[PDB]
Amino acid sequence: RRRKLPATIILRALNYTTEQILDLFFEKVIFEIRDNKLQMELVPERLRGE
Amino acid sequence: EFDAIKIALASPDMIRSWSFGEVKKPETINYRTFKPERDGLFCARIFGPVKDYECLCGKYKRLKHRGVICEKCGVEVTQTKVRRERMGHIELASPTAHIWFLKSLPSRIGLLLDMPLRDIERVLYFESYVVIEGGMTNLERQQILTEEQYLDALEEFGDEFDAKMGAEAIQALLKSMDLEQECEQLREELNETNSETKRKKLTKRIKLLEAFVQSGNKPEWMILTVLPVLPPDLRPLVPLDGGRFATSDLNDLYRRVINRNNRLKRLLDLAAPDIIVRNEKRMLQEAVDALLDNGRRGRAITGSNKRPLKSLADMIKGKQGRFRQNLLGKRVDYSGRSVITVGPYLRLHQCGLPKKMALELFKPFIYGKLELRGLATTIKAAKKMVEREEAVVWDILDEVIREHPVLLNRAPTLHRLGIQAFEPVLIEGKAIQLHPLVCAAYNADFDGDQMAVHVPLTLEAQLEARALMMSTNNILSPANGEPIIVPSQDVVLGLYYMTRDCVNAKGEGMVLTGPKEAERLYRSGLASLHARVKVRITEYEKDANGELVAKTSLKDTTVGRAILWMIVPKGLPYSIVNQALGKKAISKMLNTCYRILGLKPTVIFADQIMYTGFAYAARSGASVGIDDMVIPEKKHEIISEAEAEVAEIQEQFQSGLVTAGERYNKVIDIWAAANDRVSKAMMDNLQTETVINRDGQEEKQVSFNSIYMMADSGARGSAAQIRQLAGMRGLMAKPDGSIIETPITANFREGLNVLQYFISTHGARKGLADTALKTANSGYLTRRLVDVAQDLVVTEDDCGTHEGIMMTPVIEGGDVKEPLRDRVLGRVTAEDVLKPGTADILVPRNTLLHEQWCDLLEENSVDAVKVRSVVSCDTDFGVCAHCYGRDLARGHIINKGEAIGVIAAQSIGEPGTQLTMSSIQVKNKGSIKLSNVKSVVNSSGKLVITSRNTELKLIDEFGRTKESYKVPYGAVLAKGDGEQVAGGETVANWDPHTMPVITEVSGFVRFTDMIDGQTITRQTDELTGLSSLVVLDSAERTAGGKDLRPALKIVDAQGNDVLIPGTDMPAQYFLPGKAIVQLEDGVQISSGDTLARIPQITGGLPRVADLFEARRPKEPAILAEISGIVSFGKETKGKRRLVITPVDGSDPYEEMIPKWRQLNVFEGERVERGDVISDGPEAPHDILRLRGVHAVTRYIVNEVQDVYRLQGVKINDKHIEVIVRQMLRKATIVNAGSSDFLEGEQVEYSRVKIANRELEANGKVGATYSRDLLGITKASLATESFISAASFQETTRVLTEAAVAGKRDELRGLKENVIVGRLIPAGTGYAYHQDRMRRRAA
Amino acid sequence: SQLKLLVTRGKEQGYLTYAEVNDHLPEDIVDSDQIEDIIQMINDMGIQVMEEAPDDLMLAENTADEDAAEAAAQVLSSVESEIGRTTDPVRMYMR
Amino acid sequence: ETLRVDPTNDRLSALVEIYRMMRPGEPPTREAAESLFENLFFSEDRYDLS
Ligand SMILES: [Mg+2]
């Protein structure tokens, strides 16, 4: 109960990079763009709520 | 003796004059022979001898040498009490900063030197240098150098550069300062230059310097150079048993201050390197700052115990200090305590007292009596006799006790009736027998409660306990005239059972010849106590001027009532004892007896009522059995039907026709209905159940069910508790606050199964916690309420003023909640009361309205009286007796001396433990009267009012107002105004949805300055196919018609604008946003149609505390400062600026109405001051500033009394008004007038008034002020006696502020004279104080 | 200065917790005694900084209410402009 | 959002920041921060869940 610190500070302290942090919590949205067309690995679940 | 207290700074010379010798060494005692050490903290020759009249050497050991100093050791032969008043002094090696005058955070030293606290902190703790005389060089006074720049400038110039560091520099700075010259220069600057930033600061500094100069203190005395040491006995080293010692913390601290001090001197003798001497000086500063006030700034040093040791500033301050000892303190001799019991054989002016506890309280009196009558030669023989307890000791004790009253008290002394005085009656036991009737005052019950008895010693105390505090003098509650001697539970039941009637009673029909024969019958066994008969009664009446005329007649009664008529005194009427005589009728009987006959007959009557009630309650043998709690026989059907309803609703919810919340609400509603039905069924089966037959078939009367008799007569119980005994328990709450849907469907005659008892338990636990919480809050409220108003005292016989307040019956929402008789009884009229035709002067203008005058007032239908009130009194430092009213505790009138403040606070605080946290349809017969009405008769034949304050009152044939209602704007009144009406015709039906723009003419609608698309939304309701050119606000449409005004106007049927009668503007109402303008242009309409239609609290102790503290409500309903036509200026700031232009006065008033709040003022309107513009709670401050003192006083009285009357508590108005008087007792000066008062300043209103009175006679013009309202917690922090203010405020701050300003305290309060031990200026002591006045006025 | 808004938030809440008096401190204070001094300054003008969030029990209304408020505020507004412990005679000797 | 609020960037800076937050006055170190972080949660001697 000492003082606030951004909750990612410890994550870094545990030998996790920013990439690792974004990997553990957040999922991914991969893009298979065929150069053009902005081809996206869309899934119907991602659409829900939009 | 003395006549004032003066406090100021102490000079080193003064401190050396107090002391009797320097305290050099740190050593206390000698650890083998415990004589005080040579020259240390416990020294004989500095702080006097140890043994009475005995030198420490041991040579002089007699009372003959008293006064000589043994040359061998120097100890002065005198009393060892002298070891409790001598002081000592320590010569500090280097100066030191008195912490109180440094870390007080106005920073007295900081203010005086004009230096931030941190700078002086740096200079003191040896981290900088401060220049005291820059002189020839570039540097200037008060320029903090640094250890590098100092040597730099030394290189520049060794001399001319005085810059010390540490407490030795602040002292030089302060000494060099010249106050008068600096203040003169400040005046010079202030006059030539005038700016808001400057003027204020410069004037404040000039005031501070002048205050200091007049005080007589010198600036540099805030820096210690000699330190005093407290007398030894106040910090003792008492030897405990087993060779172990106990001492107070100060010893430790004093040692800590001597060692270091000595060491410092030693270093200065060795010319040590300056680093270590600086460290030593800092250590000594820390030691002194811990000694004066430990833990103020530096993490208080801790003793071996690990606790933080206390210091001189904690023996004064703190709840545990000498100050605040009157929180709970001062044990008292000649006192005792014990358990209490009933003892119904007593009179209400005497109390039982055990022999053992009385032969111990009165020992000195017994010794005196024994050595007076000669039964004992000396006092030692008397003590021996009293300890052996010979026979004669008891007789002597009985002689001593005879007329000696002894005070009786109970623990939570909530009001002044908690301490009374009784004449002891010796009892052979160990419990104090307390008279039954008195238990109501003490709130005592005999389940283990204890009481404490004190003995008055002197003759004045004995006389006061007999004339002011006797139990036969206090029969009226001080909070209201109603008696406090109502018999409680056994005697009310006895009198109810006696004064009743049966249908076929043994002895019915007989014609007795008086009460005596009725008693000779009942006792003889020939007639039942309640058998209807005819008796010849001879009743008296004092209708004449004090003459009790007689009248004899044959009255139908019952032998019970005839017997009860024997005790009734003279000419009370007989109808008093012809009824059921519950708990209300008996109290009313006592009140009528008191108001008609007097005091002595009333007390005798009360004793007789108690005796007869007990005696005839014994006879009835009214016990309670399990067959008396008769369950209904329809309960099962009701519960089954309720279960059917709840099952139906549950099924509907399962079918998706309702929500969970709505299913819950409907189940709750139907179960509540079932509970009500069961309760009604049980009460109907329980009240008339007794069915009796007299010489015939049958006849049903009121029941005799013992439980019903106990609940109906007011003895104990009520409808709810019986409903729990026989009906169903009902609905129960749950932790959150919700109410469990299914209620407990069982009673206590039929046990509750395992599941229902859990819920019952939760409820019980919540209640138990809540009671403690209440008792905790009420005490706080009452303490603050007495703190604000304790020095108020009636100090004159008449102030001679014609002001006052217009008392009028209270009619809120519906019909009267309290008549005028209660609100005006016992208050002196201010101006004469006239009859309806006015006919005469009816009531003179200084008549105390007692019962006869109130009755006469009610005989002419008067409903408004201008009565004198305390808040508008005119004396200074008190209240005229007439301006207050009458002492409701004693009846006659308030006398010069009564401390009305304390009694008012107690009365307002005592009940605090009981308080717990479409259309206008007429309901009475009367006649219409609209007040503040400006209406237009629309073509529909109805009436819609264009005014704002229009309200409808009902006036009977006699002319008095019957009922009150508020008439909303645009309310459709089926009636007119002043016409006849009957109960049943809805006077006004108004829809709260639409707010009209009602027009005054029936003509063509016209949309002037109404651009479609830029000032309009082209709305189209496809349901009705309504094409509405609606008006939007100024946030959606474009900039084309941004500030433009969409004007809906009524023109004539030709095309020419119709001028609205009154001004040069046609009736073009400019539409605000969201207006529902359904009709489009081209359709003339009626006069007053809805063309554009504008679309649409805690009650406990906290409410009272918030009212008295006078806090700003969350959404203050804004009021119009100055009357005039209204307009709106700037927009888009979020605060539509509203301005008012008077008819002829200037128009500077502006405001920032938050657009988050709506408005009830149309853009075109001429409003009057003190008129609501927005809606919401009205802050007391605004009421005081606009409508004046009377408005705020009425608001505060009607809110607190509303809160109280919600719970049935009775409190008179004098008390709330006297509390409100002590809130608005400060004023702000606006115009300086002619006297020497600053432009803007807060001063007490009394001083302003005396100044104006003096000026208006000298010839000059008086000053101008404005009253100000403050809370009860910021008004008590204005007292002008630091001994008073230092007892409950922060002691350190008050002491420092008083010391620097050199204040004089002249004891003129009640707290001050209590702490000092003199006679309070309030009661019997008042005369004494006045004498001193004149003697000092000489 | 977030300290000023901390004082305003404490006034608006009627109290301050230790978490609240920690979040809004300057992020460059390392010495604890300065924190102790500033919390003492806040308490002197109000509001008492208790160590937990704690309904129907009336608290001390405004005991520490006085002109001392604004001056105290100024002191707080001046604490951020500089720094220094100076509150432990041991520390000065060590330095 | 926390990452975008995090001032630190790596393990070393994070541990130094934690040391400052917990230790009032002693400057950081590449052994002191390690000791403090390790012997606060992961030490078998100064942290037991049971
Ligand atoms: Mg009890």
Ligand SMILES: [Zn+2]
């Ligand atoms: Zn001697």
Ligand SMILES: [Zn+2]
């Ligand atoms: Zn008066």
